[PDB]
Design a protein around this nucleic acid. Structure first.
Ligand SMILES: [Mg+2]
Ligand SMILES: [Mg+2]
Lengths: 40, 250, 213, 457, 255, 180, 226, 227
RNA sequence: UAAAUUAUGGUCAAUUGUUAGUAUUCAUAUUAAUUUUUUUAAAUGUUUUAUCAUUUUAUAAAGGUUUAUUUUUGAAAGAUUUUUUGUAUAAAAUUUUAGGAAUAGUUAAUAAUAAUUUAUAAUUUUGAUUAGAUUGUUUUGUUAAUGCUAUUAGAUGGGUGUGGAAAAAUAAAAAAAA
């Protein structure tokens, strides 16, 4: 699966999912560090 | 991949065939399709001689052969003259004239564009007049060298195409030979007297200081769509390679 | 590219050669009609269903498969879409454009394609119906299309077929030729089922050969 | 025990040619090529099909045993029908060049003399029609739903409907060798044997043939004189053998090969190469008694002369003595640039010549070696967007960028070169990245990705 | 609803088109049955292939099996001509005269400059090869087409004496085109197919008589029985029938 | 690609594709439990035998004493044994030629056997996952960097043909004088 | 452990050492047939099912298996099982076809002997060469019609008599005088004159109504009295 | 395929990436091709409670009985305007407030100028439909000094996230044609003073100390105690 | 129409029921299985995304088939890239019932024909067609053994036909883009 942080953008929409697929810039940076280990 | 013959559905019924691309002259997508070919043709004419591109006068063709010889014919004239039996339409659409922006700026400023429609409505003559000499250098042996517009001053280009036809209808694919210009080499050539003026250097100068570093990097504050490597999008969403990541937020 | 020119040169030199008693008819076999697999697949005149490891002598093609491209306005559920159809005819080596037109109108086998008089054209240049393929140098790889009488004004909505999505179809219009085949009344069995694609199939823009995003 | 056909023999002889082993060709000639004969004037040139297809009668089906009746496609049955076009001249040429590569003058001269006499006193055999299996017969395809040339709003895409980005390599307008006439095939054979001489010289001295690698590349070898004399004797023999028939032919490939040998074996200046080409052209025009309009040099010859200019303008870069550049002794950038400019203007005035990435690379190399620092301007004006430029252009332009007075301009030019690499789909080469990381200590330009850096570490 | 949903006759896939353009780019629409109609149905018979150099010059002489005017095939084709003329009067110029019927065994082009020495050798070879063969019997039935329907001929099915006839014609080709140089339209190692021409469109008549003989003219008689005829003579003849009202006599062997 | 997805056992990219090596075993009492390394498609039907490319071999997850070996004083040799039977040729063929996939349990087993490096799943909680910095990586790259020629040669040996023929073998193979 | 006894079975989870782990499907089940129809009123009109009928295609007893070792396989090296078949053409009434009767072979291991079973096929032929009586060889090919997937490859034996009869105009083979029976009951020749046609019809209808009366059942011993 | 991220390695399902290739994986569906996107739900989720201060009159409600005081109508208009502007700004809202419909101006988003990302669009034309916040726009997209040769239709011209700075010199009248910006690499000679590159193809920004400390704290290597 | 040997080789065939004048395998044994002494549930929230949508997620039992069930690489694996090469729907054999007779939108030719073409059509007593029974050609049980006696889960019509492939309407021992 794909992890969705609690501190992400809340989709202010009742007709769909309550959380968005975007992420914090820190989350993007820390994801890159984790993805670097995947490439090793 | 697509390497399968059609056997699931009958040939008489086109069940999943892609639509055929058709260009309409009532829409600006015609200018969108044709303008880069025009600028490439102008560059080719200015660089190397091109047959049948220079026009002494408007070609005269009888009505029976009008639909047989005129389509596909593209050339240029020094004067701003228009063929007969054609009603004139002027480009008053900013979206339509936007597509000639690169031609106007980088190649040569365009004075006007007109679409000519015959009485039988079975042809289209795109006549585009450029005012002013070519910004790019013109070789003395090039086709445009015989044109007085280079070096009134304005010169026009005529293109004939059948209406409501695929984009391959115009025969602008053949005008794509990339003949280079000799602008820098002419300076050092024997005819020019700058060969002694020019001073070449073989050894690079010594370096005393390191290059100035980039300013302090500030991480973005807005939210991010995610990694481009995973999302398979090009670096800036425009060009580049997915594997080679650059130019994004990090 | 290279195949056509090398085949032409080989045929030319084969014709020029004079010391040849002729190929053996018994030694050179023809194509078989029976083979494995439940499909009848036709190949080129120089290809065989069986393995033929030897290159046979070149021959002059007496039957060119001329392929003519017609416009066709198929009815998609989203709306009318203009696409391409190919009609293939087997014309002799010296067939005039008149008999080519006869062959295409006899082998079109489509109700809509041959509705009115049309003229054959190549790369936008009309073909004179008096001379044969020899003058034009037409091969089996030549791309030939056709221009009808009323295809020069198809951009007009009046010339375009009227879909019930945006246009109103009258009681006199439902009795016309194409709109009788189409059925605006949804039957229980829905006899006229057509190809359907979503309005957003190509995105916010229609299908194009360039990028608009 | 598959008896090879003449085409298979030709392929094996090509393998032997490239390998340099003559004993393999000795064995092949003894085993199979003994029976090969040339085409006599009275013989039938396009021999008919002789092998009747396999069939079994009633008796041969009922009484004959299963192993006899069994038939799998055996190449030994149709080897005779595959040897139906009498292409033994190619085999003779390949054997002769094998002998030359192995350095046996007696056998090489024997084969060459026999081939020459056969081509001078025998009719031209008819080439076979194109093989339906080796080269697929093209099938009809309506190029109506193909991507446009300007499909990408960032570069000129290479459309499959027709070529639009310009050829990346020059190819002379020549057909397959099987379509050559007798005298034309003789000229082609001389060209091929000279090319084999070139290959043998390159194999013998790999260091002295590569471009701008070591100082030895700029010094004349001690064995080039004998090879050049052999080439001169061979071409003089060709011109003595062919008189009037030589005038009404094409010598583009032969001229390109003699230019190449006079370029790499005996290293001569670009002006010297041009003078040799002009002398060859005027001699060819003069030997035939006619109006004799001088034939213009072709794209291959212009590529050869530009490559000679690049070789004479080459330089050793970043020597072990920390010297930035090491040039050939007696190097005159002024005259080299003058000759290059006049050659370029002549070939630009000539309309029949089509430019390609190879000759553009040669011009760029000449300009950057001469240090005029207009090579970047030429590349951006004529080569950046016109042709499929490789990474070697940036490799050449990097030293020009390092020649800049200010490290800031040098660094920014490097960045723009990398951006061009990322944009126009021309990935940077390993040696270019090596140079970038070598100068990273002062330019602070990264040349490796985070992923590959981490995995390498 | 009448039969199978997808008839076997309509499961045709064309390999002359590019693989990936038929599924999406376009759909080819044609009647593929016409080109796959068998030679038996369409009346086409595979004639010996002539080389390009021999296909240019017109023939001069031909071998034929001379037959008396009383023979059964002559009156069978006479009745066929009567029926054809009664049905349609426009095929009379295409139809040949009943008195100009012969069973051809080979066609060749002897140059006129050196014809005198070649004809003697040809006739002596025919005599020496027919000094042993007994008179032949051939059963004629069926119709065929040559030169893309330009030539209409009566088929010769295999039967008694047909094997002897084909062996004799192979020997004749070996002894005429093999040892001495004469331009045979076919190959000396190949066997010519015997036939009698009932209809033929001349190249000069090609202007107004169409490009080929329509099949409906001889469709009903495509498999008609024309019966058994005995041949006991052979003649090397030339294309000259108008002056004497009969076959031109250049060489003859009473087999 | 189904109207009602089998939510209990979903997969990716549909069926049938991407052969994957797993460890199938019927859920029995633990003392009678033994798995089977096997290569199969991503999607399996009710019976596993439908999609079975090849069989790798049994694995018994029970530490057992080495009764077959003699009672030896070697401490390491007297530890419990966990026997696993595996196939090498088929595994290499499916891993390299067909580019199959592996699950975490077979990956760990093969890492124990020495065929594969340790899987990403097995990690020591003592050592945290490290981070990376471009400047330090570039500094290390400049500190030590292999030659391009030797790196190309080793890449060629590892990926392309490695059993090369030297001049001694070439001289042995070259034809003998009588046929020269 | 199949080889172990019932009381010797300490556990059933795995095979401890080796062998064959096979499910013990219970053959001795005592399946029962339930009679759901009257003795003379079984719904089927030809075959009656009055007991448990054995089910299987190859598992039935006595065992019957295909025998690939026959004349056709002895003569031909068949690429696929049954690709080539030699047989006599019987029946030429459909255009461009030839019905061939080829016999395969089935082997009974229990009796250790083989028998030949005849099967008919539709073989496609052009130019209509196959005449009745020809010994022909046919091979599999692409599907041609609903029931045509064989084609003749060579005519081993030509039917000279049939060809000569066709040349004379007579049929290749005289039609047989005995055919399939249209009905189980015998067919009686009708020879009545025009006057007696109605009387014969009345007699036939009386016989038919008596057969219909037979549906009622056995006549009672005591005549119906009210 | 076209962009095999990290080669064809298939160690995990996530090794291939979230999307396999920029080209659509299925030939049938073209829309699924990889392309840059912005959060549509968040950008179109305009503030609803901000309109609760004053009532809003409906367009179809034109009867005299439903008419309100002109002061209230003006208040409603102000509320509607601020409601449109609250989420952000789109080029269709900036064009009418810029001369010549803002032709020749430089439009960029907030995320287009943060970090090493640097992209903008030089406006070339705008077509307006009945709605003033809808329509289409075309321009030249410029990325790190490299610009498109031909004009292209801009993506997401309606989402309220655009910004633009008005300059009179770059304005293009309807009489003229908007010229494409010069390319820093090819058209105009490179100059560090005029323009300095922020990210090159092999560049990647150094890890910021705040993010490094946060990651270390999350991983637990750095000590942490609750207050 | 000749013997054997440079000597056990090439690796285990073996039958057990105390009857009852005689004829004929038929009551009671042994093995295998069912049966009593209470062994023995098939889990409820699949997930991600660009947000009123899109992307990934393809054979469980239902319907009774004996001349019968047969097909893809277009998704995925899948890799510098573009590009390219090929297919495949068809077969053959084995096919049950105590008392056994007719079957049918039907055979072939033609064709992208014919509810209305042409023909002396096709199936079947060498057992057809309907009907009954039973999920088809690696499974057991018994025996010394040519036998006899078992076996399973799943392909039951279309009708805007999405998809590479309909297998697409609850049912896991399938980790499904960090
Ligand atoms: Mg019972
Ligand atoms: Mg049933």
């Amino acid at each position: 699966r794909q992890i969705r942080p609690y501190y992400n953008l809340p989709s202010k929409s009742e007709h769909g999912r309550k959380m968005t697929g975007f992420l914090t810039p820190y989350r993007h940076w820390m994801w890159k560090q984790n993805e670097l280990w995947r490439n090793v | 991949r697509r390497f399968r013959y059609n056997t699931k559905f009958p040939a008489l019924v086109s069940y999943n065939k892609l639509p055929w691309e058709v260009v309409n002259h009532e829409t600006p997508q015609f200018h969108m399709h044709v303008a880069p070919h025009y600028e490439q043709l102008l560059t080719l004419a200015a660089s190397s001689p091109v047959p049948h591109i220079i026009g002494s006068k408007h070609i005269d063709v009888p009505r029976e052969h009008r639909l047989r010889l005129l389509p596909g014919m593209l050339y240029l004239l020094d004067g701003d003259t228009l063929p007969g039996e054609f009603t004139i339409n002027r480009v008053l659409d900013p979206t339509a004239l936007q597509y000639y922006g690169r031609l106007s700026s980088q190649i040569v400023t365009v004075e006007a564009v007109r679409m000519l429609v015959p009485d039988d409505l079975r042809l289209l003559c795109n006549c585009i007049t450029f005012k002013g000499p070519l910004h790019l250098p013109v070789a003395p042996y090039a086709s445009l060298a015989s044109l007085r517009g280079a070096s009134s001053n304005c010169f026009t280009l005529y293109h004939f195409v059948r209406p409501n036809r695929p984009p391959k209808e115009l025969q602008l694919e053949k005008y794509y030979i990339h003949a280079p210009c000799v602008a820098p080499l002419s300076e050092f050539a024997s005819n020019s007297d700058e060969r002694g003026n020019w001073r070449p250097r073989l050894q690079a100068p010594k370096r005393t200081r390191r290059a100035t570093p980039l300013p302090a990097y500030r991480p973005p504050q807005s939210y991010l769509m995610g990694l481009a490597e995973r999302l398979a999008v090009v670096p800036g969403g425009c060009f580049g390679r997915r594997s080679l990541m650059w130019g994004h937020w990090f | 590219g290279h195949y056509q020119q090398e085949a032409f040169e080989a045929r030319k030199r084969f014709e020029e050669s004079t010391t040849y008693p002729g190929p053996i008819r018994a030694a050179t076999p023809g194509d078989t009609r029976f083979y494995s697999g439940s499909l009848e697949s036709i190949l080129h005149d120089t290809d065989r269903h069986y393995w033929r490891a030897v290159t046979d002598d070149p021959r002059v093609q007496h039957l060119i498969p001329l392929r003519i491209r017609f416009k066709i306005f198929t009815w998609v559920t989203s709306g009318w879409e203009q696409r391409m159809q190919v009609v293939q005819i087997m014309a002799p080596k010296d067939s005039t454009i008149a008999q080519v037109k006869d062959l295409v109108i006899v082998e079109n086998q489509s109700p809509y394609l041959c509705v009115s008089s049309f003229h054959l054209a190549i790369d936008g240049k009309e073909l004179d119906p008096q001379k044969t393929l020899g003058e034009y140098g037409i091969t089996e790889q030549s791309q030939i299309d056709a221009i009808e009488q009323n295809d020069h004004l198809l951009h007009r909505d009046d010339e375009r077929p009227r879909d019930w999505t945006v246009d109103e179809i009258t009681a006199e219009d439902v009795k016309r030729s194409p709109y009788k085949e189409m059925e605006m009344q949804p039957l229980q069995n829905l006899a006229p089922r057509y190809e359907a694609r979503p309005k957003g199939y190509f995105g916010r823009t229609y299908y194009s050969g360039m990028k608009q995003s | 025990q598959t008896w090879p056909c003449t085409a298979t023999i030709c392929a094996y002889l090509d393998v032997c040619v490239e390998a340099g082993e003559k004993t393999w060709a000795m064995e092949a000639w003894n085993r199979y090529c003994t029976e090969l004969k040339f085409l006599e004037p009275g013989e039938v040139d396009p021999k008919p099909i002789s092998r009747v297809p396999f069939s079994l009668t009633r008796e041969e089906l009922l009484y004959l045993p299963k192993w006899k009746k069994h038939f799998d496609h055996d190449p030994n049955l149709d080897v005779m029908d595959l040897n139906r076009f009498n292409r033994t001249r190619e085999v003779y040429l390949r054997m002769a060049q094998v002998m030359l590569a192995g350095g046996e003058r007696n056998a090489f001269q024997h084969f060459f003399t026999k081939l020459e006499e056969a081509m001078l006193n025998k009719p031209t055999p008819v080439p076979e029609p194109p093989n339906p299996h080796l080269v697929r017969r093209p099938r009809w395809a309506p190029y109506e739903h193909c991507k446009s040339v300007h499909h990408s709003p960032w570069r000129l895409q290479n459309n499959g409907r027709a070529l639009a980005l310009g050829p990346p390599v020059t190819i002379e307008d020549e057909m397959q060798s099987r379509f050559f006439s007798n005298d034309q095939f003789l000229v082609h054979s001389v060209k091929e044997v000279l090319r084999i001489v070139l290959q043998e010289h390159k194999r013998a001295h790999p260091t002295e043939c590569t471009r701008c690698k070591t100082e030895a590349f700029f010094y004349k070898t001690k064995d080039a004189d004998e090879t050049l004399k052999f080439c001169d004797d061979l071409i003089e023999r060709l011109f003595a053998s062919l008189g009037v028939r030589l005038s009404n032919l094409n010598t583009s490939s032969l001229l390109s090969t003699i230019l190449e040998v006079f370029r790499v074996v005996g290293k001569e200046s670009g002006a010297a190469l041009l003078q040799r080409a002009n002398e060859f052209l005027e001699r060819k025009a003069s030997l035939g008694d006619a109006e004799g309009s001088r034939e213009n040099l072709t794209a291959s010859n212009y590529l050869q002369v530009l490559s000679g200019f690049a070789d004479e303008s080459a330089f050793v870069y970043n020597t072990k003595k920390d010297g930035t550049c090491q040039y050939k002794t007696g190097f005159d950038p002024r005259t080299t640039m003058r000759h290059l400019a006049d050659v370029v203007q002549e070939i630009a005035g000539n309309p029949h010549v089509t430019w390609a990435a190879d000759m553009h690379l040669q011009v760029v190399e000449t300009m950057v070696g001469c240090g005029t620092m207009k090579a970047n301007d030429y590349f951006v004006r004529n080569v950046l967007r016109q042709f499929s430029w490789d990474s070697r252009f940036l490799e050449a332009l990097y030293v020009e960028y390092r020649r800049q007075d200010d490290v800031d301009m040098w660094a920014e030019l490097t960045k723009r070169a990398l951006v061009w690499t990322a944009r126009y789909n021309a990935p940077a080469s390993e040696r270019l990245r090596r140079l970038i990381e070598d100068d990273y200590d002062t330019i602070r330009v990264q040349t490796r990705t985070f992923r590959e850096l981490a995995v390498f570490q | 609803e009448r039969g199978l949903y997808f008839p076997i006759n309509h499961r045709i896939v064309d390999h002359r088109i590019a693989p990936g353009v038929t599924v999406e780019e376009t759909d080819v629409q044609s009647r593929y049955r016409r080109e796959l109609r068998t030679n038996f149905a369409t009346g086409e018979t595979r004639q010996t292939i002539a080389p390009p150099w021999s296909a240019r010059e017109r023939p001069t002489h031909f071998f034929s099996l001379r037959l008396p005017s009383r023979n059964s095939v002559t009156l069978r084709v006479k009745e066929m001509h009567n029926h054809l003329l009664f049905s349609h009067q426009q095929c009379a110029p295409m139809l040949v005269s009943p008195t100009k019927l012969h069973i051809t065994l080979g066609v060749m082009t002897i140059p006129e400059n050196s014809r005198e020495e070649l004809v003697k050798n040809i006739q002596q070879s025919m005599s020496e090869t027919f000094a042993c063969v007994q008179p032949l019997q051939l059963r004629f039935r069926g119709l065929g087409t040559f030169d893309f329907g330009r030539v209409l001929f009566i088929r010769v099915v295999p039967e008694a004496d047909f094997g002897r006839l084909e062996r004799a014609v192979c020997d004749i080709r070996r002894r005429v085109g093999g040892v001495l140089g004469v331009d045979l339209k076919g190959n000396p190692h190949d066997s010519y197919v015997p036939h009698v021409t009932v209809a033929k469109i001349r190249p000069n008549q090609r202007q107004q008589l169409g490009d080929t003989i329509p099949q409906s003219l001889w469709a009903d008689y495509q498999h008609h029985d024309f019966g058994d005829v005995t041949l006991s003579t052979v003649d090397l003849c030339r294309m000259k029938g108008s002056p004497d009202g009969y076959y031109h006599t250049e060489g003859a062997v009473h087999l | 690609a189904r109207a009602v997805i089998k939510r209990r056992s979903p997969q990716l990219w549909g069926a049938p594709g991407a052969p994957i090596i797993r460890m199938r075993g019927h859920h029995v009492v633990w003392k009678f439990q033994s798995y089977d390394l096997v290569v199969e498609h991503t999607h399996k039907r009710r019976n596993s035998d439908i999609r079975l490319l090849h069989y790798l071999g049994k694995h018994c997850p029970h530490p057992q004493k080495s009764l077959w070996s003699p009672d030896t004083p070697v401490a390491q040799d007297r530890h419990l044994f966990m026997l696993t039977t595996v196939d090498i040729d088929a595994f290499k063929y499916w891993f390299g030629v067909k580019r199959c996939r592996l699950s975490m349990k077979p990956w760990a087993l093969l890492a124990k056997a020495g065929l594969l490096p340790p899987s990403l799943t097995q990690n020591s909680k003592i050592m945290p996952k490290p981070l990376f910095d471009k400047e330090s990586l570039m500094r290390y790259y400049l500190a030590n960097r292999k030659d391009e020629d030797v790196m190309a040669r080793e890449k060629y040996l590892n990926y392309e043909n490695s059993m090369v023929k030297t001049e001694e073998e070439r001289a042995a193979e070259r034809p003998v004088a009588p046929y020269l | 452990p199949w080889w172990n006894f019932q009381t010797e079975h300490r556990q059933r989870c795995v095979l401890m050492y080796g062998g064959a782990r096979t499910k013990n499907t219970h053959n001795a089940n005592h399946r029962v047939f339930i009679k759901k129809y009257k003795r003379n009123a079984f719904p089927n009109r030809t075959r009656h099912h009055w007991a448990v009928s054995m089910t299987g295609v190859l598992s039935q007893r006595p065992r019957r298996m295909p025998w690939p070792y026959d004349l056709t396989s002895l003569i031909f090296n068949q690429p696929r099982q049954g690709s080539d078949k030699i047989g006599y053409v019987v029946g030429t009434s459909m255009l461009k076809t030839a019905v061939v009767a080829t016999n395969h072979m089935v082997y009974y291991p229990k009796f250790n002997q083989r028998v030949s079973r005849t099967k008919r096929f539709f073989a496609h032929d052009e130019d209509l060469a196959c005449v009745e009586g020809d010994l022909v060889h046919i091979k599999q090919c692409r599907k041609i019609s609903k029931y045509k997937h064989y084609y003749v490859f060579s005519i081993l034996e030509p039917n000279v008599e049939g060809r000569e009869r066709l040349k004379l105009g007579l049929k290749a083979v005289p039609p047989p005088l005995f055919g399939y029976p249209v009905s189980r009951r015998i067919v009686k020749l009708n020879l009545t004159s025009t006057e007696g046609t109605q009387e014969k019809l009345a007699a036939a209808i009386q016989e038919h109504v008596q057969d219909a009366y037979r549906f009622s059942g056995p006549t009672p011993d005591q005549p119906r009295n009210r | 395929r076209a962009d095999p991220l990290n080669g064809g390695s298939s160690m995990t399902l996530g090794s291939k990436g979230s999307k396999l290739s920029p080209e659509p994986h299925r030939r049938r569906m073209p829309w699924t091709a990889a392309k840059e996107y912005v959060p549509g739900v968040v950008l179109n989720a305009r503030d609803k409670m901000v309109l609760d201060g004053v009532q809003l009159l409906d367009i179809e409600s034109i009867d005299r009985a439903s008419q309100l005081d002109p002061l209230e109508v003006l208040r409603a208009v102000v509320a509607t305007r601020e409601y449109n502007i609250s989420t952000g700004k789109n080029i269709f809202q900036l064009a009418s407030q810029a001369t010549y419909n803002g032709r020749g101006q430089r439009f960029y988003r907030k995320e287009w100028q943060e970090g090493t990302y640097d992209k903008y669009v030089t406006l070339s034309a705008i077509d307006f439909d009945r709605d003033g916040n809808k329509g289409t726009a075309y321009g030249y997209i410029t990325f790190h000094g490299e610009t498109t040769t031909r004009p292209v239709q801009v993506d997401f011209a309606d989402v309220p996230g655009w910004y633009m700075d008005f300059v009179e010199e770059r304005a293009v009248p309807f009489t003229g044609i908007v010229p494409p910006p010069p390319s820093i690499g090819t058209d105009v000679p490179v100059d560090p003073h005029s323009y300095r590159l922020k990210a090159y193809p092999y560049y990647d920004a150094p890890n910021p100390p705040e993010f490094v400390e946060r990651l270390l704290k999350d991983r637990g290597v750095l000590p942490d105690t609750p207050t």
